[PDB]
Structures are given as structure tokens and as C-alpha cells.
Ligand SMILES: O=C1NC(=O)c2c1c1c3ccccc3[nH]c1c1c2c2ccccc2n1[C@@H]1O[C@H](CO)[C@@H](O)[C@H](O)[C@H]1O
């Protein structure tokens with residue numbers, strides 16, 4: 001519901017990216033849209049696939065990360081989402097870049113993947129698995145469609161520890177507004193990957209590199225009030241902004257990059 005409504009405006013705050021950014025710290029002079037493309041690059045380093053490999057983009061957004069994958073690495077990409085609106089935009093972006101024969105997007109719920117077993121050489125889940133009610137079932141479906149020796153690269157949120165009473169309400173606003181159905185610590189995350197049948201190969205805590213994205217995204221929204229206001233209204237937009245601004249006050253909100261292999 002959330003996505004179909006506001007995808008247009010958010011996609012555009014990050015050029016075509018619907019995910020956060022990677023900075024060298026708060027005093028970094030990279031644009032939000034630049035920091036978003038830097039995050040795509042950081043996850044590409046965790047996905048050792050080569051030309052002609054077939055990759056599944058779980059939670060594809062409007063397809064810019066997927067298209068970047070096909071351009072840099074030469075992989076065929078099938079992206080899945082649950083927003084029919086996003087899929088139509090993503091497939092046209094692929095037609096626009098002349099990659100329709102390499103990159104396609106279809107409807108699919110990551111918890112019941114509509115693909116045969118071992119049909120993909122790699123899986124790519126950028127900032128999407130926290131929308132899953134049962135994250136373990138999504139990882140189990142991911143391992144199933146991965147061929148033996150296939151690789152997985154996850155970018156996602158994590159909780160670095162328990163939140164103090166004074167920040168309880170800011171966490172709750174972050175989880176309800178951001179659609180964060182699953183949020184766990186790194187230990188609990190690494191354990192699920194193993195329980196799904198995947199052998200962990202990388203684990204990067206990049207929380208400090210991503211935390212600025214919270215504050216800077218709020219500033220971009222204010223600058224984009226013209227695009228957001230008609231779709232929400234002053235009261236709805238002020239709360240959206242506030243959700244981000246409060247989320248930045250929770251230091252236990254982190255971010256991790258994982259890489260795994262199928263046995
Ligand atoms: O509608 C919303 N109400 C919120 O409170 C909201 C909303 C959205 C939203 C709507 C359409 C398309 C993408 C959207 N991202 C939203 C939101 C949030 C939100 C609130 C606090 C902290 C982070 C938040 N983020 C995060 O934004 C990242 C950058 O786009 C996403 O990658 C990440 O998944 C997401 O958690």
C-alpha cells in the first residue's frame with residue numbers, strides 16, 4: 001500500500017534508487033542520490049557473479065539497481081516486487097536502456113517465489129527483506145531458487161542492541177512508517193541465513209556509513225515538498241518527515257551487508 005502511493009516521489013529523491021546511502025561519515029559531501037549509487041556499488045562487491053549469470057532482484061523497486069547490475073557485470077536480471085505500478089516503471093526503464101532482452105520485472109511475493117529450483121546463479125536483496133513478515137521463509141525461498149554454489153548479497157537494517165526507554169517511541173515510529181516488519185540484530189540475522197541453508201561469507205556493519213541517510217533524506221523531502229504534498233497533505237507530510245527525523249535519533253538503528261553461498 002505504502003509503495004504504490006509514494007514510489008513516484010521517493011524514486012527521484014535518489015534518481016531512480018529507492019534505498020539509503022553510503023557516506024564516509026556525517027562530514028561527507030556526497031549527494032543523497034550519489035550516496036545511494038555508492039550503496040549499490042558497495043553491495044555489488046559482495047555479489048561475485050560474472051557475465052551471463054542470472055540474478056534475481058528481490059524487491060526491485062523501479063529497477064535502477066537491477067539495470068546497474070546488468071551494465072556493470074553483464075548479468076541477466078529478473079526483478080520481483082508486489083507493486084504492479086513499480087513493475088511497469090521498471091520494465092520501461094529497462095526498455096529505455098535497451099536491456100529488455102536481459103532485464104525483466106514481474107510480480108512476485110518473495111515468500112512464495114514463482115520460479116523453479118536452482119534457476120538463478122545469484123540473488124540480490126537491497127533493503128527489501130525487512131518488509132517480510134516471515135524473513136526466514138524468504139531466505140528459504142531464496143536458497144531454493146539459488147543453484148548449488150549460487151551467491152546471495154543482502155543489504156538491510158539491523159538493531160545493534162536494545163533501545164533505551166527515551167527512544168522507544170522513535171523506534172516504533174520508524175518501524176510502523178518504514179514498513180519494518182522484521183528487524184533483528186546481526187547475530188540473529190547471521191543465524192537465519194544458516195538455518196535457510198546458506199553458508200555465510202561476508203558480514204559488514206556499515207551502520208555509521210548509512211545513519212546520515214536518515215537526516216539527509218528528511219532534508220530532501222522538505223526540498224521536494226512540491227512533489228509530496230499533493231499526495232499526502234500537510235499533516236501527512238509533516239508526519240512522514242518527522243518519522244525520519246525521529247529515526248535518526250535512535251543510535252541502535254544500524255545497517256549491514258551480508259554475503260552468502262549455497263553450501
Ligand atoms: O511512506 C512512508 N512513511 C514512512 O514513515 C516512511 C515511508 C517510506 C516510503 C514510501 C515509499 C517508498 C519508499 C519509502 N521509504 C520510506 C521510509 C519511511 C521511513 C520512516 C523512518 C525511517 C525510514 C523510513 N523509510 C525508509 O526509506 C528508505 C529510502 O527510500 C527505504 O529504502 C526504506 O525501505 C524505508 O524504510
Ligand SMILES: Nc1ncnc2c1ncn2[C@@H]1O[C@H](CSCC[C@H](N)C(=O)O)[C@@H](O)[C@H]1O
Nearest residue numbers: 017018019059060061081082109110128131
Ligand atoms: N513480500 C514482498 N515480496 C517482494 N517484494 C516485496 C515484498 N515486500 C516489499 N517488496 C518490495 O521491496 C522493495 C523495497 S524498496 C528496494 C527497491 C530497490 N531494490 C532499490 O533499492 O531501489 C519495493 O519494490 C517493494 O515493493
